[PDB]
Amino acid sequence: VLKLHHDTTLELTDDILCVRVSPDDRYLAISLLDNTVKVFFLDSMKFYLSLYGHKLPVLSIDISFDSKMIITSSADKNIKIWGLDFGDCHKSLFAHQDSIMNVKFLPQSHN
Amino acid sequence: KYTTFQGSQNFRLRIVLATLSGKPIKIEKIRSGDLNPGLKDYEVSFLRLIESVTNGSVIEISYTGTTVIYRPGIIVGGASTHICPSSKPVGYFVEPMLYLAPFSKKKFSILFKGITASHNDAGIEAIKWGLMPVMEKFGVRECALHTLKRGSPPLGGGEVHLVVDSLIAQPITMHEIDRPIISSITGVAYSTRVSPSLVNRMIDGAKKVLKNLQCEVNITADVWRGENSGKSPGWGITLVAQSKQKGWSYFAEDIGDAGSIPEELGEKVACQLLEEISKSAAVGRNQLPLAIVYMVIGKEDIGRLRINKEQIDERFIILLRDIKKIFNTEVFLKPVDEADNEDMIATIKGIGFTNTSKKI
Amino acid sequence: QHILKNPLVAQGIVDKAQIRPSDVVLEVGPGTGNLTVRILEQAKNVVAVEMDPRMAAELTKRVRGTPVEKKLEIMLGDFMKTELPYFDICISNTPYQISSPLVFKLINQPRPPRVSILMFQREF
């Protein structure tokens, strides 16, 4: 304060598509060209997490108001709901015949 | 009801040493200064385990739950399944059985069901590569511990299968007056319900810390998925240094935390390995009470064991004050002649011990 | 095409390969799948390279409906002309005549296999 400058850059290897920060300001998720989602710690960028098995690149990432569930919708016709505690999924979900562009949450509950 | 111990400290140790001796004990004032005084649930659950393996043992709990009476019966054993309560891991239940494992009337084929790791108690990998090798040196040859299903906190659902077939008359008289020279460092990294990449990341951290040491370092990468992996996700690593010539193994372990860095935990346990080795002489600090007992209940003969003063803590003395209250065996400690270190030789005349129960 | 009438021999070749549970095994010349079925139980993946389409069809049939079927990949055709994937160890039981080109293909493969266990002639 109103102008913009950079603190850091992140040197990656893939064609970045969506990046989302936690509303709890803890987690920073990143989609890549690979079937991978990297969730970073906010404060020191420690590479907390990586995800696999999606076969097509992630088109939008959500996480909850309280950082519990990750949703990484991609062009592979399905939604894979990742649990944010231990980096596993709870349930994958085939839907939306063509390819899934954007997903967003409700701030009240997991809907 | 003649030997009396105070306090809930080393409670599963005191049931063991009464059982091998056959001297009845009465442990009173267990957790008397609590808002919920008395035993815990698992300490009651462990007393059901001794009943299942020994016919004739009488176990009495007062209605305040702080006084436990135990007149031991003979070790029968056989095959059965024990359910482990979710407070303490299945490995914790396994450790007391190993002390009475070579002496039963029959084979121990005991099936354990529950959570298979924690912060405090022994993981499956630690028992297999730490407790089992010590048993083999004494003379317990056909001893094993199989893994059926691996669990993890908080739900677990894992299964191990303790199978001990060597039924010997006494542990042989061990003489180890030489610090064993570590040949190789071997560790097992496991993970359930989570990414295979995390296990690879854990291995990278441990190798980097141990890169300076010149020895072959191989960590088995074990990945578990599906129903066999278990109800709750989690991971852990167990690292084992070993000496081929004397068959002596040293280990350290830990599991993953709610949000832990797998680069750090692979680096941490390898530090906890080398910290354990730096305090060690011919055992570990967590292998020493298994071997102190086996010199005592070995036959009527002097054994020798080269141990280090860093192992000797407050915890080590309470081990030697539980033996003297049961077996009345003073453990003579002599200095070594090597002036570079403070090793001492622990010499024990073993009490003359047999198998009451084995048939001829 | 000949078959190994010795069932207590394949075990020794598999032992000398020193399989790890994470290994990708390249099996060249799987034949009727006598070694293949045993390799599948001990390794993460078996990439079997077979020239004969009849033998490849039988090999698919042999593992069909078993719990380890999904860990078998069958590459059909001449191994010499095959671009080989990454593999940790190799087992061979292919015809002796190929053996000569095959050794130098293995040696020159980009990232060489850590270990290989191969069946050749007594003179070769």
UniProtKB/Swiss-Prot annotation, chain A:
It is found in: Nucleus, Nucleolus. WD repeats lie at residues 53-83. Belongs to the WD repeat WDR3/UTP12 family. The chain holds residues 504 to 629 of 943 of the full protein. This is U3 small nucleolar RNA-associated protein 12. It comes from the Eukaryota. It comes from Saccharomyces cerevisiae (strain ATCC 204508 / S288c) (Baker's yeast). The lineage of its organism: Eukaryota, Fungi, Dikarya, Ascomycota, Saccharomycotina. Present with 9620 molecules/cell in log phase SD medium. Interacts with snoRNA U3. Interacts with MPP10. Component of the ribosomal small subunit (SSU) processome composed of at least 40 protein subunits and snoRNA U3. Involved in nucleolar processing of pre-18S ribosomal RNA.
Swiss-Prot record, chain B:
GO terms for biological process: endonucleolytic cleavage in 5'-ETS of tricistronic rRNA transcript (SSU-rRNA, 5.8S rRNA, LSU-rRNA); endonucleolytic cleavage in ITS1 to separate SSU-rRNA from 5.8S rRNA and LSU-rRNA from tricistronic rRNA transcript (SSU-rRNA, 5.8S rRNA, LSU-rRNA); endonucleolytic cleavage of tricistronic rRNA transcript (SSU-rRNA, 5.8S rRNA, LSU-rRNA); endonucleolytic cleavage to generate mature 5'-end of SSU-rRNA from (SSU-rRNA, 5.8S rRNA, LSU-rRNA); maturation of SSU-rRNA; regulation of rRNA processing; ribosomal small subunit biogenesis; rRNA processing. The keyword Nucleus applies. Changing R321A: Impairs the interaction with BMS1 and affects pre-rRNA processing at sites A0, A1 and A2. It is found in: Nucleus, Nucleolus. Disulfide bonds: none annotated. One of its GO terms (cellular component) is nucleolus. The keyword GTP-binding does not apply. Does not have cyclase activity. Plays a role in 40S-ribosomal-subunit biogenesis in the early pre-rRNA processing steps at sites A0, A1 and A2 that are required for proper maturation of the 18S RNA. RCL1 activates BMS1 by promoting GDP/GTP exchange. NCBIfam families: 18S_RNA_Rcl1p. Belongs to the RNA 3'-terminal cyclase family. Type 2 subfamily. This is rRNA processing protein RCL1.
UniProtKB/Swiss-Prot annotation, chain C:
It is found in: Cytoplasm; Nucleus, Nucleolus. S-adenosyl-L-methionine binds at H2, L4, G29, E50, D78, N93. Specifically dimethylates two adjacent adenosines in the loop of a conserved hairpin near the 3'-end of 18S rRNA in the 40S particle. Belongs to the class I-like SAM-binding methyltransferase superfamily. rRNA adenine N(6)-methyltransferase family. This is Dimethyladenosine transferase. The gene is DIM1.
